[PDB]
Amino acid sequence: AALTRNPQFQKLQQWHREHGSELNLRHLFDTDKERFNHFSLTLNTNHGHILLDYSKNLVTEEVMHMLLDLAKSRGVEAARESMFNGEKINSTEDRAVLHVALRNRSNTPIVVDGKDVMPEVNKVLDKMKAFCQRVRSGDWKGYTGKTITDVINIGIGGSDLGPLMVTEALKPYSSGGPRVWFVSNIDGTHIAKTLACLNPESSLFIIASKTFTTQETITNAKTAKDWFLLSAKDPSTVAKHFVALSTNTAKVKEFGIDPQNMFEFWDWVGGRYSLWSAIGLSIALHVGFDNFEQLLSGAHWMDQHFRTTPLEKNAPVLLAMLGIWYINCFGCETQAVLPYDQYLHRFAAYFQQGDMESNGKYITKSGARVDHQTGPIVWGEPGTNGQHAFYQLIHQGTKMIPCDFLIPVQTQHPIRKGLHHKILLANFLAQTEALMKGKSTEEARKELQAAGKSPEDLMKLLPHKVFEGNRPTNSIVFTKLTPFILGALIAMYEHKIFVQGVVWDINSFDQWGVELGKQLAKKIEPELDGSSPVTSHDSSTNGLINFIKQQREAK
């Protein structure tokens, strides 16, 4: 792999094996009153400020220099320009990677195969707004004349999680916007419980599928139409209750959807980076197009920051290299994302896909097997809830877990004159401080010495109440969680993922494991029918199939 033989990488590993374990956060702060000033980054977007405080990390000026040197020796900047210019960096599928073009508000041309893609990008956007306007104003009528009250997005993976996470995060910006629903799982329970609360006459279905062949989505779409053609009767009506977001016109029309009701995107739009395209139609419908453009504008601002800022002060690059440090040097398997915001309850899950599906690879772009770790397992839940649960292991477990704490300064609901948000902010701050500082045996002893216990009882309990600390965290604070700021935050992590993939020299934009998945079920599906036992697979698969057949009708 290109990595382990890289001089800057070897230098970093050499340094870590000699000083890595010695680094102590509490000691670093107690010996450098300027640590925060030197290890933090403030970004004025003109639409709110974003503070990236990466000072509670196990790094020194020297470490950061070695990390930035590695990013440079690995060609991060050149790779970046290649993506922004529309080059087919997605080598395995021979495609460009242009989610950045989807939000290119500057409209600077980006040529992909002879012609600029911006014109078609803006055309779909205009088509989206036009359609969105008709639905919102009550202009677009249902087959019996009523206005649409519910919009149901049907899709899975990249055609589901982005719009879901964003609509959830931007709920405060949904007006005369119809209710939005997200059906994704093939599990019948999903569409069933969703359709049970809907009126066919005022429900609009959005079939989101890049390829338009995914079994879960097409099956759910067909079931939804049957449920519709049910109370409706007559297939000419569908045209007023079903629209599509895809890149395959034939398949769409083949399903029964007119060309005018298809909002397309392109192959250079990865599912996990598609909410910025037609896929985000449910977002626009929910919060309006002005807010959707703000979302796009926020990402564009971050794209520019990432493209024009010196690596040393580049947000996504810093986040990426700190990750490299923990992954490749400390060997941390995971990365926690902890938003202190209820609206962002699907945020960690969104990047669990975005990150893991992008960098969960073991083959370099040249085809060589990596001999180092790649993408981490991303996970998390919004705080303060986690502080009462899994933070126990973060504080006193045997695993090093880098954590990104995020929070907006201003809340969308300043109830009780801000009492709730004040407490939320206090916990946000106190937790990272405690993870860094911990509580020594002596501090715990003195505290217990005041309990009136005694050397017998103080003794049995003391070690259990000691916190070794030295748990690294990043604190990301922003003025307010608005459509613009959310867009910037998402783009920030998209680029963090990009930078790491470059360092590891893998293809962060293909997903052969996901493609594999869409073909695996076909063989087993027909074998499930009937009570006759199956013996064509390994004994476990056979045994499970036979248990299923046996229990299928059990009362």
Which residues form the interface with ligand PA5 (CB under 6 A)? 156-159, 209-211, 214, 217, 271-272, 357, 388-389, 511, 514
Q: Which two tokens stand for residue 366?
A: 């040249």
**Parallel/antiparallel/unpaired status of strands 334-339 and 262-264:** unpaired
Judged by beta carbon, residue 118 or residue 514, the one nearer ligand PA5 is: 514
Residue 437 contacts which entry, ligand PA5, a second copy, none (Cβ below 5-8 A, type-dependent): a second copy
Q: 501 near 359, Cβ under 8 Å? A: yes
Quote the crossing angle between the two packed helices 289-308 and 315-324, to the nearest 10°: 70
Give every CB contact of residue 404 below 8 A, 6+ residues apart in sequence.
Answer: 319, 335, 336, 337, 338, 473, 474, 476
Residue 22 contacts which entry, ligand PA5, a second copy, none (Cβ below 5-8 A, type-dependent): none
User: Which residue in 264, 303, 357, 505 binds a second copy (CB under 8 A)?
Assistant: 357
Under rule CB under 8 A, which residues in 24-43 are in contact with a second copy? Answer: 26, 29-30, 32-37, 40, 42
Task: Tell whether residue 55 is a contact of a second copy (CB under 8 A).
Answer: yes
Q: Is 357 a catalytic residue?
A: yes
Q: 56 near 475, Cβ under 8 Å? A: yes
**Residue 214 annotated as binding?**
yes
Judged by beta carbon, residue 157 or residue 288, the one nearer ligand PA5 is: 157
What single DSSP character describes residue 534? P
Give the Cβ contact number of residue 185 at 10 Å. Answer: 12
**Residue 353 annotated as binding?**
yes
**Residue 159 annotated as binding?**
yes
CA-based end-to-end distance of the chain: 56
E strands, 345-490, where?
Answer: 377-379, 403-410, 473-480
Which residue sits closest to ligand PA5, CB atoms considered? 157
Task: Tell whether residue 387 is a contact of a second copy (CB under 8 A).
Answer: yes
Under rule CB under 8 A, which residues in 435-474 are in contact with a second copy? Answer: 436-437, 439, 459-468
- The alpha carbons of the chain give a radius of gyration, in whole angstroms, of 26
Max Cα–Cα distance, the chain, nearest Å: 84
Q: Which of 33, 233, 388, 522 is catalytic?
A: 388
Dihedral sign (CA 171, 173, 179, 182): negative
Task: Tell whether residue 23 is a contact of a second copy (CB under 8 A).
Answer: no
User: Which residue in 23, 370, 448, 458 binds a second copy (CB under 8 A)?
Assistant: 370
Give the binding range for a second copy (CB under 8 A) out of 70-78, 287-295, 313-321, 544-552: 544-552
Q: How far is the CB of 336 from ligand PA5 (least distance, A)?
A: 17
User: Which residue in 78, 111, 230, 423 binds a second copy (CB under 8 A)?
Assistant: 423
Q: Which two tokens stand for residue 338?
A: 């902890």
The phi and psi torsions of 206 (rounded to 5 degrees) equal: -115, 110
**Could you tell me which of 74, 111, 167, 69 has the C-alpha nearest to residue 502?**
74
Q: Which two tokens stand for residue 116?
A: 């600029």
**Residue 60 annotated as binding?**
no
Residue 139 contacts which entry, a second copy, ligand PA5, none (Cβ below 5-8 A, type-dependent): none
Residue 111 contacts which entry, ligand PA5, a second copy, none (Cβ below 5-8 A, type-dependent): none
Residue 48 contacts which entry, a second copy, ligand PA5, none (Cβ below 5-8 A, type-dependent): a second copy
Distances (CA, A) of 531 to 10, 498, 538, 549, 554: 60, 49, 19, 6, 13
CA distance 504 to 360: 11
Q: Is 81 a catalytic residue?
A: no
Judged by beta carbon, residue 357 or residue 494, the one nearer a second copy is: 357
**Residue 441 annotated as binding?**
no
Q: How far is the CB of 486 from ligand PA5 (least distance, A)?
A: 20
Q: Which of 518, 527, 537, 549 is catalytic?
A: 518
Q: 225 near 203, Cβ under 8 Å? A: no
**Residue 158 annotated as binding?**
yes
Q: How far is the CB of 260 from a second copy (least distance, A)?
A: 29
Q: How far is the CB of 55 from ligand PA5 (least distance, A)?
A: 29
What single DSSP character describes residue 271? G
**Could you tell me which of 12, 99, 57 has the C-alpha nearest to residue 296?**
99
Q: Is 518 a catalytic residue?
A: yes
User: Which residue in 361, 487, 488, 491 binds a second copy (CB under 8 A)?
Assistant: 361
As annotated, the binding site for D-glucose 6-phosphate includes 158-159, 209-214, 353, 357, 388, 518
Active-site residues, by number, are 357, 388, 518
